[PDB]
Design a protein around this ligand. Structure first.
Ligand SMILES: [Cu+2]
Length: 99
């Protein structure tokens, strides 16, 4: 399933902000507008047993063009918070429920 980075109107949002997927489904984050963006998972807001390092971009890796993607597939059930490193403090945060 596709998650946009930036809304069409320039808002600093993941689109959608909240959604659910079955365990293992691919999640494709797709750069849209309002650059730069990236995608990390918060070590303090993922299921016990999850290693964020292997599902997170480097903070130093920034997406600056429309249509670039970052794909992950989450094996473990429960709630994950993802965020954009440059825009963390502007509210560009989202939640995925893996079921
Ligand atoms: Cu961003």
């Amino acid at each position: 399933v596709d998650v946009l980075l930036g809304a069409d109107d320039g808002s600093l949002a993941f689109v959608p902000s909240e959604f659910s997927v079955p365990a293992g489904e691919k999640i494709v984050f797709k750069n849209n507008a309002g650059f730069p963006h990236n995608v990390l998972f918060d070590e303090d807001a993922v299921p016990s047993g999850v290693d964020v390092s292997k599902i997170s971009m480097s903070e130093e890796d920034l997406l600056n063009a429309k249509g670039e993607t970052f794909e992950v597939a989450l094996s473990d059930k429960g709630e994950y918070t993802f965020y954009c490193s440059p825009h963390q403090g502007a509210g560009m945060v989202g939640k995925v429920i893996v079921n």
